[PDB]
């Protein structure tokens, strides 16, 4: 039940903080490029 | 040899404080009993006098002159120099905020600059207090 | 220093001749360290950080940490107590 | 001739370890070891919140956790055989991009037009306007990579220098005076290597400046 | 000028209020003289001498 | 030696961020 | 040269303004001394 | 299983770096770690200031764990025991 | 061997971008010290600071473009 | 032979960061003296110092990126 | 090999523009501090800055022409 | 050939740390004039001086990291 | 192989042009702050500024004479 | 061949240590200015100057240690 | 090939005179700002400025002499 | 080839003289500005400049010695 401890902060700052999808896309594209090299 | 006195009250006459900081118009300066001779115009701020003994003094001053000659004789002349205790921090903040409010009121460039002098003096007062 | 070292050596010799304790384990730690140096421990890049970093930590603890304890107790606690 | 190795062990246990170093008691009076942590948190929070002075101060309660985490991870690396998680480029890359994206998207969420207008430095010569615009946008896109590298490179370089000088000392079976001098150099360097905390300050302060500029 | 309860002296003191006349060979030794700073200093010195003469 | 791969190193840091912010939220002045 | 200087404000006016600010900063207990220092007696004949 | 690790962590916290918290506060004030920095079996650790015994133990455990991890890569010098 | 020389020339050519960094640091520090005296940042002061920064960065990126042309 | 050329080119491209170090040193050195003259650091007096660091370190990281591209 | 020499020389020759960039930065920064000291900006304060910038650019352009001669 | 490239590339790359030395010299020099103008040594005068020294040392070690990579 | 050496030697000697640019930028910049301090610009102030610029350019051209000599 | 590489690297590496010479020069010059303003040799001015010179020479000697590693 | 090595070494050694140009530019600029601050003209100010110029240009000339010795 | 490598290394190592020239220029220029700032030049003010020269040019001569040793 640690979710409710920072639940307000989570959606309070991730409206733009939770853009880790961009990081995941960049990492996946880099891994695909390296596998093409691999 | 420190000569610090207002037009009405005298703080130090020939005192070997050997360390005085003044709120100069251009900025801040520090006397070290050997500082290069110069003439410095005071700015709204506080003069923290550091005596040769470990004790120091803090006086908020008005505009004036910092005259340090080739020798150690420094004639600091402040128009309205008082200790910080005599002032009121609450009145300080109130005057600062009122002056900030009235800064745009003075349409004249000279008058707005005068109110800017007022807000600068109040900000230095707030920092000192 | 040197005089204290002779006194400590005499005290150890007195315990060494008899017991005066429940099988002092300091010799055990010394022997374990010697065996580790002989077989397990490898003296490679040890002086790099194993000695230097620990020495810096020792200097910090024997130095400013005494004042840090004061800065904790006599400053943090008493402030909220007074408040 | 010893090959330096910033190996990759099971990362999760090592990375989670600095968190356990800070206990949080639910008492009016702390344990005189969390108390110093609380005082440091307050002292740094005042410095970080001084500049913002906006509704973005909500971000400060997360930036405090960020600075604490980076400092704890980097300070623990000074141990003999500690593996710095920040040595690997992966996690710092995964930290720099999301936070910069958060800053720019927060800027584009409120007063979006003026946020993009921050490229204009209030006029400037019109003859060089396109050059200034392309320069500043390339700098803005550079900023995440810059933030990641300015941490990764020097965090790795500290360990690299420590390893090099330590190997020099170990291989120096010659005159013991030179060995002692090199060991003194090692200790001086490690005292300087304790300034990795200043690197934490630089990273977090640059992030704060970016967020304040865009919000 | 007040000398004593019964004696006084009518004293004359020069005033170099002009900025140019303020600058001289001695001002070379004095640092941060500039032009505006020395002008404001001279004006304040004029006020000070007026006050002293008044007293 | 040189950093490659970049898969699970960048994944545990988010969980550690959650843990650290939850822990420091309890901290108060 | 500043915002006040070279814009119509004499340095004496600068001193007057900062001195008045300092006097107003004083509490009412020391306001008598500030009033004493404040000189408005001299008038103008033209 | 994990409940036992949590209990062990709580016991370690109480022993070193320790309303009802008044008992816990007095326990921390006593500083059982301060008395024995190297546990009851030994005398003390080299650092002798700041009541930092528990943090020193935690750091030493982390260091030895990382040494166990790194022992695979490193290799000795001589098959015979070192001097 | 020609590609080898292209590589070495590209490596040596981008060195010229160093002067841009030193110039930008100098001009920004000078902006700091100038603003320390005259509180007129929202004036031609910051305008000329941006002008100098842009000129230095443009010189550095011109050298970088020359290096890229050498590489390709 | 191309690997050798990449090595030497990356080595040469690395030296282009010296200007970045000179610039950051100059800008921060002017920052300290600017604060010494005027005790208003929390303002643009330090904001522009940070901005100058950000805009001057760009050359060094650009040159090192070029060096890495040559190396890899 | 001759083209290889041309490439390496052009890469080495173009680095002389870095000093021009540093001089440009110094010129603009000193212009900043000069205007901070005295507000006679529209006077020869800007003219001397233009004069310094033009000479630094001329030196950099001469280095660029030397690099072009090496390349061609 | 490859080992020769490693050596020459490292020798080149380590020359880029000179600019960081110049930067630390500049900032630590400016420390002394800041202290002379304002005797507030324990304050931000020395705090930001240490910050600048750390930043320039970072700019230098992050350069020599490339030389270390080249050598190994 | 000598003709191959000509281009690399010319490129290596061209680096000295950077110092001349830095020097001329510094001297011209000081002229700006000098004129800022003292309005006696057309005097030995500007005279010695021209003197320093000419000496720096003479040093730079003297350096480039080595490149022109080795190339031919 | 590798001995030739060591010679070339030692030639190139030692220049980085000499670039720190400008750093101690700036330190001593700022010391000159500070002592000119507030003459007190026993004050923290000399200590700060010594610390800055020591840090610059430490950067130089670390570059020289890299050079020695190149040699050995 | 030995002649080629002498040529490239002379080209490399020619760089060490750029710092002489930077130093003479800086010292002449200093002389400018000092004369601006102090009307003293033909006193130790100008003599020491000429002395510094002579020393820096002599160091540069010695570097160029070493370059010539490598060349011949 | 060994003589060739020693030649190119000595030529490369002579670049370090550039730092010495810049440092000497800086120290002498700060001596100039300090003398203009205060008439205490004949005091420890001049001695500090002498020491700064004797350190920066000492580093330059150390680099020159390294170049000579590589040459021989």
From Swiss-Prot, chain D:
Per the UniProt entry, what are the Gene Ontology biological process annotations, in alphabetical order? proton motive force-driven ATP synthesis; proton transmembrane transport
Q: Where in the cell is it found?
A: Mitochondrion inner membrane
The record gives the membrane topology as: Multi-pass membrane protein
Which molecular function terms from Gene Ontology are attached?
proton channel activity
Q: Describe the reaction catalysed, as an equation.
A: H(+)(in) = H(+)(out)
Q: Which Pfam families match?
A: ATP-synt_A (PF00119)
Family annotation (InterPro entries) = ATP_synth_F0_asu (IPR000568), ATP_synth_F0_asu_AS (IPR023011), ATP_synth_F0_asu_bact/mt (IPR045083), F0_ATP_A_sf (IPR035908)
**Chief location of this protein?**
mitochondrion
Give GO cellular component annotations, separated by semicolons. Answer: mitochondrial inner membrane; proton-transporting ATP synthase complex
UniProt keyword list: ATP synthesis, CF(0), Hydrogen ion transport, Ion transport, Membrane, Mitochondrion, Mitochondrion inner membrane, Transmembrane, Transmembrane helix, Transport
Species of origin: Sus scrofa (Pig)
Question: Function, please?
Answer: Subunit a, of the mitochondrial membrane ATP synthase complex (F(1)F(0) ATP synthase or Complex V) that produces ATP from ADP in the presence of a proton gradient across the membrane which is generated by electron transport complexes of the respiratory chain. ATP synthase complex consist of a soluble F(1) head domain - the catalytic core - and a membrane F(1) domain - the membrane proton channel. These two domains are linked by a central stalk rotating inside the F(1) region and a stationary peripheral stalk.
Assembly, per entry: Component of the ATP synthase complex composed at least of ATP5F1A/subunit alpha, ATP5F1B/subunit beta, ATP5MC1/subunit c (homooctomer), MT-ATP6/subunit a, MT-ATP8/subunit 8, ATP5ME/subunit e, ATP5MF/subunit f, ATP5MG/subunit g, ATP5MK/subunit k, ATP5MJ/subunit j, ATP5F1C/subunit gamma, ATP5F1D/subunit delta, ATP5F1E/subunit epsilon, ATP5PF/subunit F6, ATP5PB/subunit b, ATP5PD/subunit d, ATP5PO/subunit OSCP.
Keyword set includes Transferase: no
List the PROSITE patterns hit by this protein, alphabetically. Answer: ATPASE_A
Where along the sequence do coiled-coil regions lie? none
Q: Where are the transmembrane segments?
A: 1-17, 59-79, 88-108, 127-147, 155-175, 180-200
**What protein name applies here?**
ATP synthase F(0) complex subunit a
The similarity annotation says: Belongs to the ATPase A chain family.
Curated annotation (Swiss-Prot), chain F:
GO MF annotation terms: proton transmembrane transporter activity
**Cellular location(s):** Mitochondrion membrane
| An example Gene Ontology biological process | proton motive force-driven ATP synthesis
List UniProt keywords, sorted A-Z: Acetylation, ATP synthesis, CF(0), Hydrogen ion transport, Ion transport, Membrane, Mitochondrion, Transmembrane, Transmembrane helix, Transport
Q: Which GO terms describe its cellular component?
A: mitochondrial membrane; proton-transporting ATP synthase complex
Q: Which residues cross the membrane?
A: 4-20
Biological function = Subunit 8, of the mitochondrial membrane ATP synthase complex (F(1)F(0) ATP synthase or Complex V) that produces ATP from ADP in the presence of a proton gradient across the membrane which is generated by electron transport complexes of the respiratory chain. ATP synthase complex consist of a soluble F(1) head domain - the catalytic core - and a membrane F(1) domain - the membrane proton channel. These two domains are linked by a central stalk rotating inside the F(1) region and a stationary peripheral stalk.
Its family?
Belongs to the ATPase protein 8 family.
Q: How does it assemble?
A: Component of the ATP synthase complex composed at least of ATP5F1A/subunit alpha, ATP5F1B/subunit beta, ATP5MC1/subunit c (homooctomer), MT-ATP6/subunit a, MT-ATP8/subunit 8, ATP5ME/subunit e, ATP5MF/subunit f, ATP5MG/subunit g, ATP5MK/subunit k, ATP5MJ/subunit j, ATP5F1C/subunit gamma, ATP5F1D/subunit delta, ATP5F1E/subunit epsilon, ATP5PF/subunit F6, ATP5PB/subunit b, ATP5PD/subunit d, ATP5PO/subunit OSCP.
Write down what this protein is called.
ATP synthase F(0) complex subunit 8
- Species for this entry: Sus scrofa (Pig)
* Gene that specifies this protein: MT-ATP8
Q: Which residues of the full protein are shown?
A: 5 to 33 of 67
UniProtKB/Swiss-Prot annotation, chain H:
Point out residues bearing the modification N6-acetyllysine. Answer: 15
Q: Which residues carry this modification: Phosphoserine?
A: 2
Residue(s) carrying N-acetylalanine? 1
Regions that span the bilayer = 57-74
What are the annotated disulfide bridges?
none
- GO CC: one term? mitochondrial inner membrane
- Record carries keyword Mitochondrion: yes
Record keywords, A-Z: Acetylation, ATP synthesis, CF(0), Hydrogen ion transport, Ion transport, Membrane, Mitochondrion, Mitochondrion inner membrane, Phosphoprotein, Transmembrane, Transmembrane helix, Transport
The record's InterPro entries line, in alphabetical order, gives:
F1F0-ATPsyn_F_prd
Q: Name one Pfam family in it.
A: WRW
Where is this chain's protein located in or outside the cell? Mitochondrion; Mitochondrion inner membrane
What is the membrane topology noted in the UniProt record heading this document? Single-pass membrane protein
> Which top-level group of life is the source organism from?
Eukaryota
Gene Ontology terms: biological process? ATP biosynthetic process; proton transmembrane transport
Task: Please state the protein's primary subcellular location.
Answer: mitochondrion
Function summary: Subunit f, of the mitochondrial membrane ATP synthase complex (F(1)F(0) ATP synthase or Complex V) that produces ATP from ADP in the presence of a proton gradient across the membrane which is generated by electron transport complexes of the respiratory chain. ATP synthase complex consist of a soluble F(1) head domain - the catalytic core - and a membrane F(1) domain - the membrane proton channel. These two domains are linked by a central stalk rotating inside the F(1) region and a stationary peripheral stalk.
The entry's family comment says:
Belongs to the ATPase F chain family.
Q: How does it assemble?
A: Component of the ATP synthase complex composed at least of ATP5F1A/subunit alpha, ATP5F1B/subunit beta, ATP5MC1/subunit c (homooctomer), MT-ATP6/subunit a, MT-ATP8/subunit 8, ATP5ME/subunit e, ATP5MF/subunit f, ATP5MG/subunit g, ATP5MK/subunit k, ATP5MJ/subunit j, ATP5F1C/subunit gamma, ATP5F1D/subunit delta, ATP5F1E/subunit epsilon, ATP5PF/subunit F6, ATP5PB/subunit b, ATP5PD/subunit d, ATP5PO/subunit OSCP.
Q: What is this protein called?
A: ATP synthase F(0) complex subunit f, mitochondrial
Organism of origin: Sus scrofa
Protein's gene: ATP5MF
